[PDB]
Amino acid sequence: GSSLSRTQIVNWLTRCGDIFSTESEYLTGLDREIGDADHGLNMNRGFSKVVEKLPAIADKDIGFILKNTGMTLLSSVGGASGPLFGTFFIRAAQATQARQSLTLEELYQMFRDGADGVISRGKAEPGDKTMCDVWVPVVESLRQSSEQNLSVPVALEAASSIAESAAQSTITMQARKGRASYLGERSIGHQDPGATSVMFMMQMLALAAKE
Amino acid sequence: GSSLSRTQIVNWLTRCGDIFSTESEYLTGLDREIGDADHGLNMNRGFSKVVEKLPAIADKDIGFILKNTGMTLLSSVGGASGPLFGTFFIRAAQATQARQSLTLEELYQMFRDGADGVISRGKAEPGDKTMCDVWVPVVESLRQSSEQNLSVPVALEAASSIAESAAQSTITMQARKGRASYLGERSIGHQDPGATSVMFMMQMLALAAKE
Amino acid sequence: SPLIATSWERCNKLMKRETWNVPHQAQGVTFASIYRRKKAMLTLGQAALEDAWEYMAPRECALFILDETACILSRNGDPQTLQQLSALGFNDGTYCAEGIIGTCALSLAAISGQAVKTMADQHFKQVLWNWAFCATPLFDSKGRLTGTIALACPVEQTTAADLPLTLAIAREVGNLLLTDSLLAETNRHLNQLNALLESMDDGVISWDEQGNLQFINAQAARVLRLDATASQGRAITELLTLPAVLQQAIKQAHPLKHVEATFESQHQFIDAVITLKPIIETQGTSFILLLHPV
Amino acid sequence: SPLIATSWERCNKLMKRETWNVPHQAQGVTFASIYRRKKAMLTLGQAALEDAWEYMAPRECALFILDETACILSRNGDPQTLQQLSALGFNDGTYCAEGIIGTCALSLAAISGQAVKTMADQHFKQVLWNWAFCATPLFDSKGRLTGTIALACPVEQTTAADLPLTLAIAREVGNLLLTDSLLAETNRHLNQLNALLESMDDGVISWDEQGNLQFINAQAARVLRLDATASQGRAITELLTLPAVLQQAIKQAHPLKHVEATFEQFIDAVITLKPIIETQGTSFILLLHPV
Numbered sequence A, B: 001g002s003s004l005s006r007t008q009i010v011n012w013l014t015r016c017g018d019i020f021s022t023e024s025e026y027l028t029g030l031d032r033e034i035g036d037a038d039h040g041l042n043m044n045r046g047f048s049k050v051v052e053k054l055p056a057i058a059d060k061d062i063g064f065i066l067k068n069t070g071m072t073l074l075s076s077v078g079g080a081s082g083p084l085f086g087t088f089f090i091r092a093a094q095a096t097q098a099r100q101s102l103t104l105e106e107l108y109q110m111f112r113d114g115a116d117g118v119i120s121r122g123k124a125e126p127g128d129k130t131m132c133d134v135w136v137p138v139v140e141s142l143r144q145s146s147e148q149n150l151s152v153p154v155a156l157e158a159a160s161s162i163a164e165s166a167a168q169s170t171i172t173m174q175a176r177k178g179r180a181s182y183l184g185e186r187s188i189g190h191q192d193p194g195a196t197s198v199m200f201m202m203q204m205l206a207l208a209a210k211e
Numbered sequence C: 001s002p003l004i005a006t007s008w009e010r011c012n013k014l015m016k017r018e019t020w021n022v023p024h025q026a027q028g029v030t031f032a033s034i035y036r037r038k039k040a041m042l043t044l045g046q047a048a049l050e051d052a053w054e055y056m057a058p059r060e061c062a063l064f065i066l067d068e069t070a071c072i073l074s075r076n077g078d079p080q081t082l083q084q085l086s087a088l089g090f091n092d093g094t095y096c097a098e099g100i101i102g103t104c105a106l107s108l109a110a111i112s113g114q115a116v117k118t119m120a121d122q123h124f125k126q127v128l129w130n131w132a133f134c135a136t137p138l139f140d141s142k143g144r145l146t147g148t149i150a151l152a153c154p155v156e157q158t159t160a161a162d163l164p165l166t167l168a169i170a171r172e173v174g175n176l177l178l179t180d181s182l183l184a185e186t187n188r189h190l191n192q193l194n195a196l197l198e199s200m201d202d203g204v205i206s207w208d209e210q211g212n213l214q215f216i217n218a219q220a221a222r223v224l225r226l227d228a229t230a231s232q233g234r235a236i237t238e239l240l241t242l243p244a245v246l247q248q249a250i251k252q253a254h255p256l257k258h259v260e261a262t263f264e265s266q267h268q269f270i271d272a273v274i275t276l277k278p279i280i281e282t283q284g285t286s287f288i289l290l291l292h293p294v
Numbered sequence D: 001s002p003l004i005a006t007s008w009e010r011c012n013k014l015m016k017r018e019t020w021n022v023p024h025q026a027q028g029v030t031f032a033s034i035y036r037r038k039k040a041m042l043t044l045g046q047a048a049l050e051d052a053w054e055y056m057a058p059r060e061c062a063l064f065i066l067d068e069t070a071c072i073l074s075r076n077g078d079p080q081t082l083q084q085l086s087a088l089g090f091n092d093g094t095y096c097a098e099g100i101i102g103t104c105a106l107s108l109a110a111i112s113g114q115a116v117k118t119m120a121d122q123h124f125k126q127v128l129w130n131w132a133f134c135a136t137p138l139f140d141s142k143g144r145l146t147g148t149i150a151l152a153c154p155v156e157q158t159t160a161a162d163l164p165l166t167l168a169i170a171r172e173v174g175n176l177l178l179t180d181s182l183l184a185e186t187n188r189h190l191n192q193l194n195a196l197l198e199s200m201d202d203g204v205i206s207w208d209e210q211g212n213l214q215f216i217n218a219q220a221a222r223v224l225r226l227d228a229t230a231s232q233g234r235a236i237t238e239l240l241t242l243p244a245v246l247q248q249a250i251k252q253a254h255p256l257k258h259v260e261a262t263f264e265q266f267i268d269a270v271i272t273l274k275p276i277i278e279t280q281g282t283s284f285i286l287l288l289h290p291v
């Protein structure tokens, strides 16, 4: 209850490899409506590589594992999301150097830095219709859980539920960043694929925390 | 004189930093007659970065030291010669992994491998008027000294001499590779600057091996 | 160019300028195997190429990744241009060796070892006189040829930035293979370090110039009664209270060998024989503390 | 573009479209400091830019590297184009911030955090209407803005490939800063491993999956009578005769803990064998516990 271990982090990333494989066509379909129809394919391409690398590094510390993961996503995903998800994991990795276990306060700090990283690099604001429309509430959710002293598995179920609502909330937003914003008003009525990716990640983290 | 220590290799590279500084004008002058007038400037940019990095890695093995060096030369020299001197050092690095000392036969092997790397990457032949016109006889010099069981210091003094003759031998060659070969027949009558670089390196190695 | 002319002399032996036929094209299973073993360079290459296209569209051009044998592994770019090149036989798995299609950047880059451009009637085969090709070879983690990046376009639309673009992308994919291999090298050193720590006799605790615990083995963690997995990455000051003898030495960056020492772990006294090993680096001093078994 | 328009709305506050004066330009000493602070990024960028120029020349264009504060650090490319821009005030040290030269890729790249091209009257300042700029920000080892790669040419000579070129060069330079930092990180781990080996009580010898000794400490060197500095990088089978026990354990990738053994003149020790199982093969640490 009290902490997330590195084995759980590894099991998290393994589950992200699976979700990005099964959800590939779905994510791509979301990206077909408002983009260049590639987001599922590219997330699967990057995450497949992540999970390939992971057995070799699974006995290492959390920082080194997140750093490989970020570095991998950074060069193998492509487009707008690759640099962003890579920055997330790289920033998380620098906060967790040598860690083998994280308290809920620490997990929250990790996500915070992660998210600051992606906002800083991509300059997205609330309502811009991007992945930051899920990251910001996710971080706020973990901060509240940390204050209330919730166990890690309950905290992570809460952030996962929040991630879902935040992804849903992107549907009615007009895109102001990335490829979708080319469509002007025509991006309204369609869920953002980057935001759906973050949700998937959070749902998988929630599962890994049970084990 | 049975072996070259890694501390000698470090002192070799430090001495190369000094020679590419003081002979910068000259190498650039050689490169002005038949190239784009940058070769001294660039070797100095590369090698000063090399020598900057050296104190941090001086307590390590030969392979790691030559790997850092070649990697630095690789990305910071530019043009035709950067990738070439880079490859030389990277090949040498992979032959000397974990070494703290090299016998004369091992020394010959390193240089053999580096030379093979530069030949295989630039495709140059005896007579093309390039740095390979010095590398090949230097390697052949070291093989001979190896068979005759010469001390490392005497062997290196002999390669150093061969390297001088070999660089001078490039003067009457017409260039068939690199920027010089644009000049056609007008490249005859001028010493090759890459070749003069290899000579400077062999002269400094010869000095390092005394210490 | 002597490069072109020399290439023409090789092509002259076995090949005519006006002929063109069905491609020599890897197929079904053998192709899947080529694709599979080129995975590392491919996935990196395909991301890079998607990006090059994105900031270039609209434009009549195509981008190719080829393996070290001139076999086309992937294509992207303008749909129409890709269909035209496909009509000439260039598809996934088509080999573009000089011995098959004549003098062309697609092969000459790897043959020459450098970024190369061929246009119009520099090409041996007349079918290619309407095309410009730029290509650059790319290299391993270990310095050998592993593939080629190329850009194909109608000859009248060539731009001066086409060649340096293939060069910069080949160098980027190259360096990315190198960074994958650097990370794998560090993982191998971490394995050495971890195996040493798990199998040795001494207890060990080690910390940062920033005060943060980097490693502790089972032996040190039982003795100093510290948590075996939650200590790492936390301030050593908030982990245990250090004796007077250590405090001095630690401030003074001064080594200690086989010395006696008394510790405190959450209100409790431990007696031990220790060694303190300073590690002096540009960024500050780090420490290793060994607890010798009595 | 909403990027351009939004940028114009920032410029409309403090600036006029028709004015142009003398540059804001880092000078003498203070430029020497900016230059020195930017060494790592600069030297990588200069080699890359020289290379890009060579495979591109002849052409009317200029290439700039700028630091995170949009200060021009280095220029190269076409002499005449470089003079035309020098006359407009673009030299080494010239600041190209939006609040100085108006909406322009030179700053808009860093502001947007991506590759950007501006041409002709997209430019806030009329002086720039004869020009195209492409630019891409570049990033640290640690993901922060560290500078910008730009390409400038007369507007009528712009090419579709100019923008992806600056992008690919900025990414090349970024990744090169990253590989510099991975090598440092690996060096720091080697410091850890070497300091452990030198100070611990146990003797140690470790070799590769290929058979080559990777490390040996003073302690193991004394006992097994090996050369403490010419043993490393050599085949372990050339260095010493391994007792039958070990020999069989090695054959099988099988651990030994505090087992007794005898080496070759004869030495009796209590050893541990520790296999390291990796995708490239199996390696070994052998420790000699001090009786």
Ligand SMILES: Nc1ncnc2c1ncn2[C@@H]1O[C@H](COP(=O)(O)OP(=O)(O)O)[C@@H](O)[C@H]1O
Binding pocket: A031, A035, A036, A038, A039, A042, A078, A079, A080, A081, A082, A084, A118, A122, A123, A124, A129, A130, A131, A132, A177, A178, A179, A192, A193, A194, A195
């Ligand atoms: N500036 C930005 N900040 C945060 N997220 C962004 C930004 N630009 C784009 N994105 C995200 O990237 C997603 C699209 O990613 P993807 O399809 O992988 O890349 P691309 O759009 O380049 O093809 C969008 O759904 C959006 O969530």
Ligand SMILES: Nc1ncnc2c1ncn2[C@@H]1O[C@H](COP(=O)(O)OP(=O)(O)O)[C@@H](O)[C@H]1O
Binding pocket: B031, B035, B036, B038, B039, B042, B078, B079, B080, B081, B082, B084, B121, B122, B123, B124, B129, B130, B131, B132, B177, B178, B179, B192, B193, B194, B195
């Ligand atoms: N294909 C090649 N093989 C071997 N050496 C080469 C080749 N091309 C060029 N060189 C060497 O590089 C030197 C030129 O180096 P330099 O001026 O640093 O680069 P650049 O010519 O691109 O400006 C030449 O004097 C020659 O020795």
Ligand SMILES: [Mg+2]
Binding pocket: A031, A035, A036, A037, A038, A039, A079, A179
């Ligand atoms: Mg997309």
Ligand SMILES: [Mg+2]
Binding pocket: A036, A038, A078, A079, A080, C050
């Ligand atoms: Mg895309």
Ligand SMILES: [Mg+2]
Binding pocket: B031, B035, B036, B037, B038, B039, B079, B179
């Ligand atoms: Mg030159």
Ligand SMILES: [Mg+2]
Binding pocket: B036, B038, B078, B079, B080, D050
């Ligand atoms: Mg040059």
